[PDB]
Design a protein around this ligand. Structure first.
Ligand SMILES: CO[C@@H]1O[C@H](CO)[C@H](O)[C@H](OC(=O)c2ccc(C)cc2)[C@@H]1OC(=O)c1ccc(F)cc1[N+](=O)[O-]
Ligand SMILES: [Cl-]
Ligand SMILES: [Cl-]
Length: 138
């Protein structure tokens, strides 16, 4: 397993047709997972499955600019389960990040950070055993 939190450098940032694949297994009794696509200290795209927010499971997405969180985007479809292996695929499209989990489309998140070639790191954190994290151009 990789050591979490794990930094995956994205050389030259992201660009449409770039596919990021994250393979891992959710720990037992998980509380949270996070993917943080970073532009320096800013978070262009925060993808945050929350296993217990007032006893409901929700994915929170958001952007952090100059240490300030923005307006959350919430999805109640929640494909993750404690103890089970998952695959997250993040495909960069021209207007959004497109996210599929276990080969099923989950959500999209409009680009708020516009300098895609400056989103140069992906932070992977939380209650997972991380098998692998990689990218390919499709
Ligand atoms: C207003 O709350 C914040 O919302 C942000 C998204 O708009 C971020 O998700 C942020 O988390 C971190 O940046 C963060 C968290 C932990 C670490 C180890 C490092 C960084 C924080 O979330 C929680 O604290 C939260 C609130 C209610 C919840 F049920 C669950 C969570 N949670 O997952 O932390
Ligand atoms: Cl490692
Ligand atoms: Cl920008």
């Amino acid at each position: 397993m990789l050591i979490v939190p794990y930094n995956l450098p994205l050389p030259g940032g992201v660009v449409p047709r770039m596919l990021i694949t994250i393979l891992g297994t959710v720990k037992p009794n998980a509380n949270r997972i996070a993917l943080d696509f970073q532009r320096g200290n800013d978070v262009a795209f925060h993808f945050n499955p929350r296993f217990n927010e007032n006893n409901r499971r929700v994915i929170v997405c958001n952007t952090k600019l100059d240490n300030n969180w923005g307006r959350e985007e919430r999805q109640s479809v929640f494909p993750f389960e404690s103890g089970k292996p998952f695959k997250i695929q993040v495909l960069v499209e021209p207007d959004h990040f497109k996210v599929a989990v276990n080969d099923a489309h989950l959500l999209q998140y409009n680009h708020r950070v516009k300098k895609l070639n400056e989103i140069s790191k992906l932070g992977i954190s939380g209650d997972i055993d991380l098998t692998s994290a990689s990218y390919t151009m499709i």
